[PDB]
Amino acid sequence: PRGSHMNPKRIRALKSGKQGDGPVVYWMSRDQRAEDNWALLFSRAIAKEANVPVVVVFCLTDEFLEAGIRQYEFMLKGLQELEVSLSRKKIPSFFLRGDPGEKISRFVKDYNAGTLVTDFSPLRIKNQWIEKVISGISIPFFEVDAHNVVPCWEASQKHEYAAHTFRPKLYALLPEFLEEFPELEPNSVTPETLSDVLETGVKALLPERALLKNKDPLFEPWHFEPGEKAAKKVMESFIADRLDSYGALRNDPTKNMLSNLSPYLHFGQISSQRVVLEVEKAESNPGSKKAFLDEILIWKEISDNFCYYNPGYDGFESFPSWAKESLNAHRNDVRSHIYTLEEFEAGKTHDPLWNASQMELLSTGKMHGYTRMYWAKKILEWSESPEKALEIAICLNDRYELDGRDPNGYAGIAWSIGGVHDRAWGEREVTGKIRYMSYEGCKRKFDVKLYIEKYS
DNA sequence: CGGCTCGCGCA
DNA sequence: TGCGCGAAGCCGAT
Ligand SMILES: Cc1cc2nc3c(=O)[nH]c(=O)nc-3n(C[C@H](O)[C@H](O)[C@H](O)COP(=O)(O)OP(=O)(O)OC[C@H]3O[C@@H](n4cnc5c(N)ncnc54)[C@H](O)[C@@H]3O)c2cc1C
């Protein structure tokens, strides 16, 4: 589809047809950014060879009622900044409200689009929208992987059992797909208010707000500034101040040594390929670079491999055969404790370490990467069944995490509860052969009293 | 067959 | 804190 700096393996055809005489339409969803976006670049390249302008369309769905204000404001404020960025490049952006299966097909017919492009997401609801759009349009429909360094359908053609089998496949394709991004050329031709959608949506989510006793909100919004510009600053400070000590202080929740990039990486406000490009060129601790590259490349893209090849990624059926047989045998085991969804949500357990972990989630929207393991595994230990544990963890993870509703979450929860991408460990009660984490094990690895005292 | 992103005993 | 071992089931390189 033309291009010199454009690898054709990044784009695949969802529907064939005669290319219309209208503008090229980029259905933006996962990658909400103007820079370092292969989908927006491939849309501009197709627009250049056809001598037509490119436009961006974003469909705001009713999915925001399932989450809260913390994710709604973080995403909508970045789209307000993105609207100004695309305007400087003469790219007009259109924001629709409703079902994408019906709104995109109507926008395509109304604007007389010539070609339709969208980004890649392995989630179930995205494939449902794509099949609805294919049946309602008659122009070519393409899909570009702008979230992974190596395209998901190109890195592996099957479900990967572990990371030690996915690691050689990914790193073998890095010299081809790891490249610099070309600049977004502005439009040569020419062709709802986001402020009202923000005030309307916030007023609908106000009753469901997380509060404390004196009716004060629990969420602290000053920890992470949303937007494409702020995501660049978070990367720069991480490379300059936090990348050196990353390899040694990554599992210490009392130290702020993480990249803090998952809120921006989830909404697509920053390209993970851009982060890899800068980390590769940075002269820092070699063990710290290898530890970070293993996270943002192997573990981030293998979660896309998990959801894309297992349509029941949020279910007990996606668990391996050894894990399902172990969890099934311990179904009748008496639990030491039993808490419901409301008691897990308010942090009213007997474990001050688990409660402090839940408080960091409710107040900042980003639980530390290490405690999220202990947070999820203790749910399986103090719940009715593995299905209820999977249901409570997914609920709290997608409702209060800023990086929630992400393929990393369903793969991370399945790792902690179902042992996905893990192996079997010592036999125990209730949990069986699933990996076990203890409060005493965290006491020997970091100052637990400091973590508890920080979040009450 | 070899090696996989815990708890535990011991410097 | 840092290291070596234990307990476990299975992939995949042959
Ligand atoms: C039960 C559970 C639930 C999770 N929930 C989510 C979620 O909803 N959204 C989410 O983005 N991550 C989730 N993860 C992964 C992990 O908790 C976050 O990626 C990380 O804590 C975010 O902080 P960070 O970006 O500063 O981490 P860093 O150490 O800076 O990691 C850098 C990047 O690497 C990737 N990464 C790191 N660790 C993992 C991992 N274990 N799996 C996959 N990718 C990883 C992420 O893209 C992250 O932004 C979850 C993990 C677990 C165990």
C-alpha closest to that of A358 among A308, A327, A393: A393
The secondary structure of A141-176 as a DSSP string is EEEE--SSSS-HHHH-SS--S-HHHHHHHHHHSHHH
What residue type is assigned to position A215 of the chain?
K
A10 and A131 assigned to the same domain: yes
C-alpha closest to that of A366 among A252, A220, A212: A220
Tokens of A131: 């099949």
Alpha-carbon distance of A456 to A452, in angstroms, equals: 6
Q: What are the angstrom distances between the C-alpha of A419 and each of A113, A120, A251, A451?
A: 46, 26, 20, 26
- Domain boundary among the residues A275, A294, A315 is at A315
A113 lines ligand 1 (CB under 6 A): no
A175 and A235 assigned to the same domain: yes
Alpha-carbon distance of A14 to A29, in angstroms, equals: 16
Distance A261 CA to ligand 1 centre (A): 9
Burial of A222 (0-12, 13-18, 19+ CB in 10 A): exposed
A194 neighbors A82 (Cβ within 8 angstroms): no
Please state the φ and ψ torsions of residue A416, each to the nearest 5 degrees.
-80, -30
- Report the DSSP beta bridge partners of residue A58: A28, A95
C-alpha closest to that of A314 among A385, A232, A408: A408
Alpha-carbon distance of A164 to A298, in angstroms, equals: 9
C-alpha closest to that of A258 among A277, A274, A245: A245
Q: Which protein residues have their Cβ less than 7 angstroms from some atom of strand C?
A: A 160-162, 165, 248, 320-322, 423-427, 433, 444
Alpha-carbon distance of A65 to A71, in angstroms, equals: 10
| Number of structural domains chain A divides into | 3
A309 and A416 assigned to the same domain: no
Strand order in the sheet with A141-144: A11-15, A141-144, A115-119, A24-28, A54-60, A93-97
A109 and A193 assigned to the same domain: no
Tokens of A310: 């297992």
A309 and A338 assigned to the same domain: no
- Report the DSSP beta bridge partners of residue A143: A12, A118
What is the bridge-based pairing of β-strands A24-28 and A115-119?
parallel
Domain around A295:
147-315
A357 lines ligand 1 (CB under 6 A): no
C-alpha closest to that of A279 among A238, A250, A251, A245: A238
The secondary structure of A392-453 as a DSSP string is HHHHHHHHH-TT-SSHHHHHHHHHHHH-TT-------SSSTTS----HHHHHTTS-HHHHHH
Burial of A159 (0-12, 13-18, 19+ CB in 10 A): middle
Alpha-carbon distance of A141 to A122, in angstroms, equals: 17
The CA–C1' separation of A168 and C14, in angstroms, is 18
Tokens 């981030």 belong to residue: A300
A164 CB closer than 7 A to any strand B atom: yes
What residue type is assigned to position A453 of the chain?
E
Alpha-carbon distance of A120 to A107, in angstroms, equals: 20
Alpha-carbon distance of A115 to A141, in angstroms, equals: 6
Tokens 């993970």 belong to residue: A272
The secondary structure of A336-392 as a DSSP string is S----HHHHHTT-SS-HHHHHHHHHHHHHS---TTHHHHHHHHHHHTSS-HHHHHHH
A20 neighbors A139 (Cβ within 8 angstroms): yes
A191 CB closer than 7 A to any strand B atom: no
- Give the CA-trace dihedral at A254, A260, A262, A264, to 10 degrees: 150
A148 lines ligand 1 (CB under 6 A): no
* Method used experimentally: X-ray
A313 neighbors A414 (Cβ within 8 angstroms): yes
Please state the φ and ψ torsions of residue A173, each to the nearest 5 degrees.
-100, 5
A260 and A355 assigned to the same domain: no
C-beta atoms surrounding A252 within 10 Å: 18
- Domain boundary among the residues A298, A315, A332 is at A315
Tokens 């030491």 belong to residue: A336
Q: Coil, strand or helix: which one is A84?
A: helix
CB neighbour list of residue A291: distance below 8 Å, 6 or more residues apart: A246, A247, A250
A39 neighbors A148 (Cβ within 8 angstroms): no
Tokens 């219309």 belong to residue: A20
A397 lines ligand 1 (CB under 6 A): yes
- Return the beta strands (E) in A16-136 as ranges: 24-28, 54-60, 93-97, 115-119
Return the CA Rg of chain A: 22
Q: Coil, strand or helix: which one is A8?
A: helix
CB neighbour list of residue A276: distance below 8 Å, 6 or more residues apart: A149, A178, A293, A296, A297
A360 lines ligand 1 (CB under 6 A): no
Distance A91 CA to ligand 1 centre (A): 33
C-alpha closest to that of A442 among A220, A303, A253, A190: A253
Q: Coil, strand or helix: which one is A269?
A: coil
What residue type is assigned to position A363 of the chain?
S
The CA–C1' separation of A165 and C11, in angstroms, is 8
What is the bridge-based pairing of β-strands A93-97 and A54-60?
parallel
H or E segment and range at residue A217: none
- Domain boundary among the residues A268, A295, A315 is at A315
A311 and A322 assigned to the same domain: no
- Return the beta strands (E) in A222-320 as ranges: none
Q: What are the angstrom distances between the C-alpha of A57 and each of A9, A97, A109, A119, A241?
A: 24, 11, 13, 12, 37
C-beta atoms surrounding A435 within 10 Å: 16
A331 and A447 assigned to the same domain: yes
C-beta atoms surrounding A260 within 10 Å: 17
Q: Coil, strand or helix: which one is A94?
A: strand
Tokens of A294: 């293993």
What is the bridge-based pairing of β-strands A11-15 and A141-144?
antiparallel
Q: How far apart, in Å, do the first and last CA atoms of chain A sit?
A: 57
A308 and A323 assigned to the same domain: no
A305 lines ligand 1 (CB under 6 A): no
Q: Helix, strand, coil proportions of chain A in percent (round to 5)?
A: 50, 5, 45
Q: Coil, strand or helix: which one is A113?
A: coil
Which nucleotide is closest to A161, CA to C1'? C11
Alpha-carbon distance of A414 to A408, in angstroms, equals: 10
C-beta atoms surrounding A61 within 10 Å: 16
Burial of A94 (0-12, 13-18, 19+ CB in 10 A): middle
Alpha-carbon distance of A349 to A371, in angstroms, equals: 15
A338 and A281 assigned to the same domain: no
A211: DSSP letter: B
The secondary structure of A96-133 as a DSSP string is EES-HHHHHHHHHHHTT-SEEEEE---SHHHHHHHHHH
- Return the beta strands (E) in A260-306 as ranges: none
To 5 degrees, how large is the angle CA A57–CA A123–CA A313? 170
Angle (deg, nearest 10), helices A352-364 and A386-400? 40
Alpha-carbon distance of A348 to A345, in angstroms, equals: 8
- Write out which nucleotides of chain C lie closer than 7 A to a protein Cβ: 1-2, 6-13
A322 and A376 assigned to the same domain: yes
A196 and A255 assigned to the same domain: yes
